[PDB]
Ligand SMILES: [Ca+2]
Ligand SMILES: [Cl-]
């Protein structure tokens with residue numbers, strides 16, 4: 001491998017695995033709080049082994065734990081940092097699409113928790129940052145904002161029933177927000193709290209094969 005200059009000087013630390021089949025979506029992976037850019041690598045394998053993988057480590061630290069944007073407390077985001085980091089990530093997919101010579105307009109995100117949130121934030125703020133997105137246990141990134149039209153864009157949302165972190169009503173609030181902007185939104189339910197489960201990944205694979 002020799003994309004060494006970028007890997008060291010880009011706006012964001014990440015790993016890239018060029019895929020067996022370039023025509024398939026580049027899978028953008030976004031860890032949850034306190035994880036890292038390797039956590040979700042198993043997910044991509046289960047979802048589309050042939051697909052290119054771009055996996056990113058967030059630029060913010062909360063008590064030693066990688067996060068994609070600052071929060072004061074669970075569910076209370078720094079809204080100025082959120083937009084700045086959403087922009088930052090969008091401007092980074094720009095440079096990574098050039099540097100690794102893949103199609104800027106064909107990227108699909110698999111995020112978990114905090115990682116899912118910035119992914120949903122991209123959907124909200126930047127019309128064409130993502131072709132689609134798998135959101136494992138997301139929240140509403142921000143309220144009261146005009147979304148652009150998400151016409152040909154498909155979103156998978158996996159949420160939990162007995163979840164001490166995200167209320168199921170807020171998970172549906174997210175669905176509705178997204179549909180009102182003409183996204184096609186599939187929604188799967190698990191009843192095992194906030195943990196990311198095999199159950200959901202298998203349903204995401206299924207969904208993914210049908211949407212792309
Ligand atoms: Ca500490
Ligand atoms: Cl978060």
Ligand SMILES: [Zn+2]
Pocket residue numbers: 137138159160163165166193194195
């Ligand atoms: Zn959850």
